[PDB]
Amino acid sequence: DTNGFDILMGQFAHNIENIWGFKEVVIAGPKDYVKYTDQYQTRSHINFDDGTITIETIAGTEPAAHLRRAIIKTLLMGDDPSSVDLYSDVDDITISKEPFLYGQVVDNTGQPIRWEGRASNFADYLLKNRLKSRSNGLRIIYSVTINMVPNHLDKRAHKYLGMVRQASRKYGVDESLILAIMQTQSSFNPYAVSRSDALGLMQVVQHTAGKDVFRSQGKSGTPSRSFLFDPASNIDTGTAYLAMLNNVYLGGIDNPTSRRYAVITAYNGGAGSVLRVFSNDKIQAANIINTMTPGDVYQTLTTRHPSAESRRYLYKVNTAQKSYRRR
Ligand SMILES: CO[C@@H]1O[C@H](CO)[C@@H](O[C@@H]2O[C@H](CO)[C@@H](O[C@@H]3O[C@H](CO)[C@@H](O[C@@H]4O[C@H](CO)[C@@H](O)[C@H](O)[C@H]4NC(C)=O)[C@H](O[C@H](C)C(=O)O)[C@H]3NC(C)=O)[C@H](O)[C@H]2NC(C)=O)[C@H](O[C@H](C)C(=O)O)[C@H]1NC(C)=O
Structure with missing residues (x-):
């Protein structure tokens, strides 16, 4: 290291x-x-x-x-x-x-x-x-x-809309979600750097999300700081993680609106933390979610999940998505 x-x-x-x-x-x-x-x-x-x-x-x-x-x-x-x-x-x-x-x-x-x-x-x-x-x-x-x-x-x-269009078509992730995340995380600042070394427009951490994305694409190793600081690359990686969260780590959620609230929170907190809000065992953490309405899910997540950072994050991203959603 x-x-x-x-x-x-x-x-x-x-x-x-x-x-x-x-x-x-x-x-x-x-x-x-x-x-x-x-x-x-x-x-x-x-x-x-x-x-x-x-x-x-x-x-x-x-x-x-x-x-x-x-x-x-x-x-x-x-x-x-x-x-x-x-x-x-x-x-x-x-x-x-x-x-x-x-x-x-x-x-x-x-x-x-x-x-x-x-x-x-x-x-x-x-x-x-x-x-x-x-x-x-x-x-x-x-x-x-x-x-x-x-x-x-x-x-x-x-500057980045074209990239967002491309990434969105590629990974089947709504433009508005990508844009809502990107805005919240960096206000579209390409020099963005966090205290936990999240990097770039979509604030991607190399050893966690970056590593996962590379692995999920038959690729080896972890993206460098140069890679994640290149707009095109960063947005493609972040969007890929959005898809990985939605299909793999949180596909157990059936309702797409509930899965989204879960995916948004997990982008900032990890799908692990998000699942362990309902209980320590991924199985019925998923179906406790499958009992609630999405309003519930958004409620339960904005109030009862450990990271205060996450609880605001979900509120923030959903609030921005609503303005990028309409076209
Ligand atoms: C600007 O704010 C920062 O935003 C960032 C997001 O925009 C955010 O970074 C995100 O932080 C979370 C953790 O805090 C992180 O979630 C972890 O992700 C990894 C990779 O998917 C998980 O590890 C995998 O776990 C699965 C099983 O669940 C394994 O099968 C797999 O092999 C693991 N892969 C690897 C490479 O290890 C990890 O899951 C853990 C281990 C678990 O299940 O308990 C997730 N963590 C948790 C708690 O669930 C997320 O990916 C990461 N990066 C991105 C792009 O989203 C910043 O968070 C930093 C790191 C922070 O902690 O403060 C935000 N904050 C700051 C200050 O930078």
């Missing part, structure tokens, strides 16, 4: 904790892109659920200078998530004719940003007119907040 990945997460967080204070240890998550540059002095934070871009620095020397730098690079960054290291300070951000953010944010001119010229003017504007300052209690932080367009979610999702 290269748990030596845990180690440099530990090293990463401690390097930040040293420089920013334990009060300011902001680190990438499933719905939050956070990239440190300039030796942990400058950080760029995209918050994908709230539609905000926050670019901070704590450097006491020419803060505007390299706020400007992060601002231009972040706006123009070409999404290759598999080549970006959010647990590192090395600048592995690349400028692209087609920035990942293109269309999700407009300058104060109202124009989408794709050229270094326009990006530059916009940085200069923000620096002159929206420069903010804060202090942790012990040292001064300079920042710029950039609001993303109101329909930024839809813009982002548009």
Whole structure:
């Protein structure tokens, strides 16, 4: 095991904790892109659920200078998530004719940003007119907040719809379920990384779901971090696990709506945990489910299942699915 990945997460967080204070240890998550540059002095934070871009620095020397730098690079960054290291300070951000953010944010001119010229003017504007300052209690932080367009979610999702269509046809899993999961888990952030090393758009863990999927396809080993950070691959894997959950691990459930509630919960909690909500023996755990209505099942799962994380998850995913379901 290269748990030596845990180690440099530990090293990463401690390097930040040293420089920013334990009060300011902001680190990438499933719905939050956070990239440190300039030796942990400058950080760029995209918050994908709230539609905000926050670019901070704590450097006491020419803060505007390299706020400007992060601002231009972040706006123009070409999404290759598999080549970006959010647990590192090395600048592995690349400028692209087609920035990942293109269309999700407009300058104060109202124009989408794709050229270094326009990006530059916009940085200069923000620096002159929206420069903010804060202090942790012990040292001064300079920042710029950039609001993303109101329909930024839809813009982002548009990138992956084709993949979702394909995966859905392939594995017989509803588009709306894939989209509802993906939205809930990452808000369609391809750089998404969790505290349990779930990876990518559909937040797939390598040694559990990833391993199962490979095995179920005559394939050997476990998907790498590069693989699960490639949109197409990740969505195909996640969707495959959705199908594996639905046919194999939870096929005992007869009612498709009840199976779905079970499948959704299990995607986050494991089918094991889900079955052991009805009882320790998979057999009549399944038929206790076969006695209840789906409203029951959704009830019993949203209230009486161990992981609080899961109980909210099922509520969340079903709530999103209802909006992606109608066409
Ligand atoms: C962003 O939030 C994170 O979301 C992730 C999902 O989007 C979620 O990851 C999921 O976590 C659960 C466990 O927490 C995990 O479920 C396990 O899955 C494996 C693989 O199918 C099961 O192991 C198999 O068990 C069967 C029999 O049941 C065996 O026959 C088979 O051989 C086993 N295969 C392997 C490779 O071991 C496992 O079943 C256990 C062993 C059991 O029956 O008791 C499941 N666990 C449980 C408890 O049932 C799920 O697959 C995993 N990944 C995905 C893509 O869904 C994150 O959860 C993390 C890991 C967490 O625990 O916090 C979510 N949270 C975070 C913080 O990242």
